[PDB]
Symmetry: D2
Subunit: 472 residues, 4 copies
Amino acid sequence: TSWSDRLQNAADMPANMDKHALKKYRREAYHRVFVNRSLAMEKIKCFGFNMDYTLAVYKSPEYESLGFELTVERLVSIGYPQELLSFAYDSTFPTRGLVFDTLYGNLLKVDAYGNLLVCAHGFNFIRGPETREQYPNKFIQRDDTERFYILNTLFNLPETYLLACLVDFFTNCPRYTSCETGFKDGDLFMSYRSMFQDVRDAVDWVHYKGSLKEKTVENLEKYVVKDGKLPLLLSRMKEVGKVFLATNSDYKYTDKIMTYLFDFPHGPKPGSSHRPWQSYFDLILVDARKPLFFGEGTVLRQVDTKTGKLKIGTYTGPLQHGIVYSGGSSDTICDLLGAKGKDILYIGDHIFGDILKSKKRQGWRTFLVIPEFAQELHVWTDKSSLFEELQSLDIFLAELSSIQRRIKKVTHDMDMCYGMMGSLFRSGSRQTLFASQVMRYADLYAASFINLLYYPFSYLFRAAHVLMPHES
Amino acid sequence: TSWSDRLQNAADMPANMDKHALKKYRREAYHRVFVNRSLAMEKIKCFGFNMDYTLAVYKSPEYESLGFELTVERLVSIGYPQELLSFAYDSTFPTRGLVFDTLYGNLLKVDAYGNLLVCAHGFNFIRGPETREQYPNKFIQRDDTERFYILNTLFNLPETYLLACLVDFFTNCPRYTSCETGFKDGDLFMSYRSMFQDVRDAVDWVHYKGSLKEKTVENLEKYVVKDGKLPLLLSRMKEVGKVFLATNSDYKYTDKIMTYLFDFPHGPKPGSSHRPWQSYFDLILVDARKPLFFGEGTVLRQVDTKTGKLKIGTYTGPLQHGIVYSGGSSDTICDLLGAKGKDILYIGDHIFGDILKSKKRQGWRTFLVIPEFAQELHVWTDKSSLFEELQSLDIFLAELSSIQRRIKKVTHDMDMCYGMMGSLFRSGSRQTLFASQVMRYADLYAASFINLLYYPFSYLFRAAHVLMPHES
Amino acid sequence: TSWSDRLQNAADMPANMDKHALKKYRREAYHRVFVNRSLAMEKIKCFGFNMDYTLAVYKSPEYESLGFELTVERLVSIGYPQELLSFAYDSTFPTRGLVFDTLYGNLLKVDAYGNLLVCAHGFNFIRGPETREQYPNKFIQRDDTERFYILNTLFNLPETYLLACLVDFFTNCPRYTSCETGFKDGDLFMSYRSMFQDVRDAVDWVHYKGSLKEKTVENLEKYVVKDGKLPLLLSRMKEVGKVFLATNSDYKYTDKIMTYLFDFPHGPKPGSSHRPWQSYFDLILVDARKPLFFGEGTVLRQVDTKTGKLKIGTYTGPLQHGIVYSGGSSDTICDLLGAKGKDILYIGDHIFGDILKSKKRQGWRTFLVIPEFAQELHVWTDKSSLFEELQSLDIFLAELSSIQRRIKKVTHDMDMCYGMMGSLFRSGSRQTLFASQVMRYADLYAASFINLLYYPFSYLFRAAHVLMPHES
Amino acid sequence: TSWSDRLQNAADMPANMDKHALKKYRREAYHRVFVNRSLAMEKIKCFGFNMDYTLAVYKSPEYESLGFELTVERLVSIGYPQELLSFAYDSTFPTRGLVFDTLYGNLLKVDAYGNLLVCAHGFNFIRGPETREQYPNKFIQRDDTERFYILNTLFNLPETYLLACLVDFFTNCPRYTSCETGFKDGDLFMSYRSMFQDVRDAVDWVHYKGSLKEKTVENLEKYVVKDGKLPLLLSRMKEVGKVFLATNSDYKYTDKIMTYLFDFPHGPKPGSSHRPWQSYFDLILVDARKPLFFGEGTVLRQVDTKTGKLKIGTYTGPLQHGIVYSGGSSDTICDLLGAKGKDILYIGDHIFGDILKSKKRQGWRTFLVIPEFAQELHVWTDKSSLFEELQSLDIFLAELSSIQRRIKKVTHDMDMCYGMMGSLFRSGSRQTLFASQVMRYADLYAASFINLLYYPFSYLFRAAHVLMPHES
Ligand SMILES: Nc1ncnc2c1ncn2[C@@H]1O[C@H](COP(=O)(O)OP(=O)(O)OP(=O)(O)O)[C@@H](O)[C@H]1O
Ligand SMILES: Nc1ncnc2c1ncn2[C@@H]1O[C@H](COP(=O)(O)OP(=O)(O)OP(=O)(O)O)[C@@H](O)[C@H]1O
Ligand SMILES: Nc1ncnc2c1ncn2[C@@H]1O[C@H](COP(=O)(O)OP(=O)(O)OP(=O)(O)O)[C@@H](O)[C@H]1O
Ligand SMILES: Nc1ncnc2c1ncn2[C@@H]1O[C@H](COP(=O)(O)OP(=O)(O)OP(=O)(O)O)[C@@H](O)[C@H]1O
């Protein structure tokens, strides 16, 4: 049971729009919208979306394995050894949000302060004392972006695992000599940094020049979650405000995916005429180039929706029915829809490029979709006893040696229930950088934005006020 | 009664080192150390200090008025109108941490998200609806550092007030025509941006080329808080670890100020031989150039402590008794003291240049001194009824029009008890950017670091664990 | 008769190595090496080459027309109008070295000071007075590289003509409205700058992702000059020094072209065994990335000459027989060959990326190949009477109105003998930027480096010393 | 007899404005204007000047020694050793235009290609073979501006000598150990780079914060050449065009110097009423900040000519009689005077900041004043026999070992007649970078712009056309 199994299970259920059924449904944690800062939904005048892993949730582990397989094949194609073909994607290893240290070739799980929570070299999980040789302060400088790469997105899950496979493979292959910063192969030296760049380039290649999109579109049922409640919720949003799409993907791929997402023998509700996906949007913008989109952006272009090609020149005209934009900036959207930032609820899955940047650069309201959250929630509630014991040990240790070794043991057993790299949100009692960024920049979050269907449009999402220590 | 009156009052009390007297003393909020993240003092091996507003707390409002007067005189000296000489510093106007908007000439109090809490043009406090003409989303882009300047330090309190005096003066003087972005004076246009730069340059000039330091040193009793408990606490720190000074000030001024701070007819305790201030430090570093200090820093130099001049060349030698450094970097300190970041408690007053940067760049532990906090605490406890009523109104409004107008009225009455720009930490129920940065980057904070004297060196400072909404 | 016709004509002649025959052959201007700075050939220890338009001279106008056709087809493929397919390359329009002004859409021929010599908007040649509206000082700022693009290479001849075709087409097509800085097409605006970037991108695409290389290699006799004297001269160079290749092209294409260049039923001389092209080189380096090559360069890689792919990792080994390098820097070559800069004669066709940069960055000696020079020389000698009359008019005008109008008329008639954009080297009595860069940075120049065959290896190439006005 | 002795000698002669006397006077080389590019004076509509070493020629060696003495005193004041006070400026050592190599501490005389002509470490002149250890290719990369500093101006003559004094002093002082890149002094290391920066900072300090200007103005007869022909030539320029001043100096100093320059008991000619210096200028601009002046420049300000202070704000008004500008850009001048670049003859002494930059950035016509040229001309004509012998040896050596050693010997004897660093313009038969920049960017040059007085305003300055080798 993967996280996308939970989501597709909830997607196969028709929407019971009885007012009592909704209030009861959103009592379960899997259907709730969780709130970091209070948000009065009645003030939202525009609902904005990205597409990938938000409207189009790619099924797991099939999609990650496809991306992994095509990336491995690209690396072999450019000269990596044939043994890469023996790799097989393993969804229990990677957790999202890890940091690859290109100097020493380690995957790191860190908190918001750069403190080390987990350190794996290949598949070898390095314990505290051994990490101090490379990390004397158990700490990394997050601003050293040349050295450290944060694997933010679900698209990064294949390469997260692949980086560890590669370090593991070169380390244990007798043709290579392991050095502090890479591998020696006779008169060739492969640094972890250049290896990382090859992987990163191959993932980009797979997405932009390879066959990933083609293989996705030829088997959409295998790769993309489909939910009849999606047209219903969007149609309700359009009744109370405006709806826009702003995706980094190109129009041809967006058209294929969105057509599939809306391919039901009916419109918003069973019994209604089917409507094209574009009719659900007041504004459609592709090739957004987020997060640059939230600053100067790029030149605003017009898509020829017949050919899927850009028309030649900068588009200077108005928002017209049927027009599709390419590029532009977030100001394009606000001007064309007559919106201010706080009028907008932007619904995305990229913690940095969608949520952090729209919040900090423009003061948009934010809803973070966390696709793995359906599975994380299941583990969290099933193992809440382990966490509670952890909280008790920390309290008992505060009043006071065998307690500290028991804290590490419970922490490990809890973390392993999530996978080898632990929970997206914490390791034991220590929060991750990702958890901290969610809390700070996502006003609302959930496994799926479809959970908004279970709340009335006048709903006041409420968070407790934050107080300083001296104020409480 | 200024905030420095509270501090000097607590400074005139001898230290009662009875173990029960300490535990009782630190029960009062004015003597507590407040905790944002747990910190086991037994792990601290090095105590580091800045000097200005930490070891040398400048008395208020005398010091701010002196800085104001010399800045006004410098501006008049370079050609500003004689009417500036009629200005008089007013400590009830400025609050620290405001943002000057150089485009429109406004002082802004903002939260961590750039939302507007207060907007004053000159001395005219602009209400919500009128601010939307210039701030359509009631929001500023904090990354637009060319436009927005954050007035972080107590040294910025004179210019905070002076900026408002100047906007007020040019606005109401018939020789000038007010425009959106500055003032027209015939064939001369003075933008708010160039006016701001003149003020900023004049404050720098006053500090580096003017008479401020000279006038301070000639009347240290008037301008600098003096506390016999300072040598005692530093001496206790040196018994359990190492002690270092890292100040942006030059050696000649540091020597004068520190000599005064230690000028008692005794050493750490009454009855003990007096010791020179330098003997309290394992490492003394001046001209630190923080925050660059916490990255590449500058070339490490050696001070000739006889002449107060730098010796010629880069210093390549070891840490020797009596040596004084200039420049260098935070790595200089860690290498020379054999410390890792988390071994260090760095005690400073600059939320950005001392605390944020040492935390994020180096993983140092941090203690933020907030000199005005003595007065803020007094107002907070005296007016806790107003805040409680505010909390109740927000709760009552959440279950549900005359409540919202009452919320704004209580918010104003509460804020005015702090001064015209309100509390350093909030406006009503909304936290400031400064409060958020304190919580995120200051592990400990207090009105004075002397409050550490009331805690044993094995003390475990404890903060509650942070949980995400779905985890609680 | 194109310039490559002259070259291939001289290539079909076997080499007469009789000492008197050589001295007599190099008396004709078409076989001379011309000298800007004295160079003692006996001091040259390494002969270095680029490949494109130096070793592999592409036949004209066939190769330019092929590049033009594929670029037009790429532009139409991305959405430019079908009328582009009616364009046909015209070798009489473009001269190399013109500057495209992306602001106003003009092709400019300039001198080294940025003075305007010729200005064409589309195919409309703008006369002096009309150019002053856009160029008030008849002058462009050459450092404004965002605005002005210098079309340095023969590869730029197709796009030189295509830019003029496009400006001409959009200007005279009634669907578009001509504006100062581009064309309006309803709600789309196409600036000259974005049009230029489309052209530039399409030329790059044609070379790197399109079919240009493929179409060249499938008909090498049509597209590439072949000369049996090339293996002979290289073999003689290797007898007295070292020989290296440093090309921006990739190994697969280099191998195909060079194999063709050496595909004779014999080696250096008729009767000798054929040798593979690689045997003529002590060092072979592809993917050079000049001019960055002459600074930090890129990571040094090793080519797997079986697969044509790079081996994985940085190459740390020594110069071995049969090894082929990729990337690296000019220091790679100097270290591996044990050469200092002035030991090296580098033979290239890129006035900026080969000659200027190797001279200024490294102090290499330089030989500039100018493929069109064979034709320019023919016109120069045939029309020397027109130039002489021009020199006389300038002298007569200096002793003194109908003379000035006659100077412009002779200047035009002379220039048109070269083509519509005149001589590569001048317009009338005014030298071009290209001529000035040749004189300053090319120690030697000729239509072909094969002209070195007509000089003994001890030859002292001599240039007259330059004197200041007061020194003569 | 210094170069300023020649100039002041020619300045003490009244102007004989008889038409025949002028034509005869400008036959002597000392009164000629030398021509690199033809210039029709009738086309010049604006004459522009800098002040320092152009209008105000500082007497030699008195002014250089004053600058040297104050710089040494500043260095000692900040901690350099007392032995510096034993230095005495020596005008026979420095030549203008040398390059200080901050890596190895050498003064270099180079040609335009970075080839080494002279290399002195301290006062030790390093011969060819010994220079190859540090300069393997006898070549420096001129674009390595962090390493190499070109000493362009006469203001740099004191520090040119001082750098050599310092290297000499530290090398031969037993307290210091000489290393490749600087000097070790126990636990202090002084790199040549930081030593150079101290010198550069001290020269700036002397000019901007020290007593150099004050000491100059208190004895103007000692320090500044005064010529009654200066008001006459400027008055004649104003009769045929406009005249402007654009100086990097401030107004207070400009006013003092210019008042002295015009302090005669008469105006342009004996017998005429004296006029204030400002009346000779249509436009006066101080604080120009050249060469940035020739790009974006700085904010245009207005000088209050009563107080010598800037008025507050940007000046938006028109060119008015009596107005004085500060800052701005070259476009300010062109707009206000209604001039295009080629209408302007700009007369300056800074080969880079005045001449090169105004030529390349704006297409101004240029006149380079070379104050030492009066003395260089004397030596050139007196030793023309040595140069002729040198030319003969080079020719004789071209037809062909004892000739080459005789070429070096004649080259040395010729160079030493100019000073220890040889001629500004060459070393033997090799031209300097400075000579090359003069030829390329100075349309006209002379020891003084006063030489323009000997030419009628319709004069056509003529230079021979430049031809490529194949064109002649
Ligand atoms: N999740 C992320 N993905 C990619 N880049 C990020 C992410 N978070 C931060 N960055 C960027 O990485 C750089 C270094 O981050 P740094 O920790 O210095 O600042 P920060 O993110 O503001 O830290 P904090 O979380 O303490 O606010 C910054 O430019 C920041 O914008
Ligand atoms: N108190 C401060 N004083 C001066 N500069 C600051 C302060 N706080 C942040 N900055 C700097 O101002 C710039 C813009 O801040 P921005 O809000 O973009 O990032 P941030 O400070 O990381 O935000 P956040 O508080 O959301 O983490 C950044 O370079 C940041 O480091
Ligand atoms: N033929 C060329 N092709 C491409 N870029 C060039 C060429 N010639 C010069 N450049 C670059 O264009 C920029 C602007 O040239 P600019 O005229 O400012 O300097 P320059 O080339 O040194 O001039 P000069 O010819 O007077 O020496 C510089 O960075 C220069 O290196
Ligand atoms: N006399 C000078 N003084 C100061 N800087 C200079 C001088 N001459 C050139 N420069 C600057 O130094 C840098 C390096 O010069 P470089 O030799 O790379 O270019 P260049 O001056 O165009 O050379 P060339 O003389 O061959 O045209 C450039 O930015 C150039 O503008």
